[PDB]
Amino acid sequence: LTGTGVLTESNKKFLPFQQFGRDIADTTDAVRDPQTLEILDITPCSFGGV
């Protein structure tokens, strides 16, 4: 997977075989780092109107 977003260290536990999770809207939310077995979070940066 690819994309652009703010990476943050989350705390949701994953299964030993799963790699990346999604949401109800089918969007990339959390991805496990390939090297270290840590669960990260993917959140888009701020956006709005002026």
Partner: protein, 172 residues
């Protein structure tokens, strides 16, 4: 996140501006609706001290001062029963829940203490028993019917309030 897509979309015309104006009109009407429904009183009337309202127990609709929220028990039940991805933004409302609660409390205090005179001129205090007697005189019956049955009327009112609370807490 595409520049060529935007350059292609610029050839279609002014549809984005139209839909944005439509959504802005919807958003401003959503606040005008509540600002017209709830904000109908000028002065915020406060509840008096310990009250002998003839025998009626208005302890389930007045604002509960225990919790910081100015919502009553029925309002708490009603709030507890009802339960940033691709450019979608949820604009916050203009009036918070606390302002709506204060408006409802002011309206309730005005209807209890003054009656029906706080919607035309200045608030005029009057005993609640005489207010109910005037209501009964408006529905057809005389004042003696209430002056001789105020106890039964207050008991039935308390029972009805309790039944309403039970029905709201049981099913929604």
């Amino acid at each position: 996140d595409s520049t060529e897509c935007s350059n292609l979309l610029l050839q279609y015309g002014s549809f984005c501006t139209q839909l944005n104006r439509a959504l802005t009109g919807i958003a401003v009407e959503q606040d005008k609706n509540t600002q017209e429904v709830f904000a109908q009183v000028k002065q915020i009337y406060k509840t008096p001290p310990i009250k002998d309202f003839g025998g009626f127990n208005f302890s389930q609709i007045l604002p509960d001062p225990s919790k910081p929220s100015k919502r009553s028990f029925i309002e708490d039940l009603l709030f507890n029963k009802v339960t940033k991805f691709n450019g979608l933004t949820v604009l916050p409302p203009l009036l918070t829940d606390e302002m709506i609660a204060q408006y409802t409390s002011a309206l309730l205090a005005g209807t209890i203490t003054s009656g029906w005179t706080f919607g035309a001129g200045a608030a005029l205090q009057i005993p609640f028993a005489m207010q109910m007697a005037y209501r009964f005189n408006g529905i057809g019956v005389t004042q003696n019917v209430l002056y001789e049955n105020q106890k039964l009327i207050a008991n039935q009112f308390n029972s009805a309030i309790g039944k309403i609370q039970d029905s709201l807490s049981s099913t929604a």
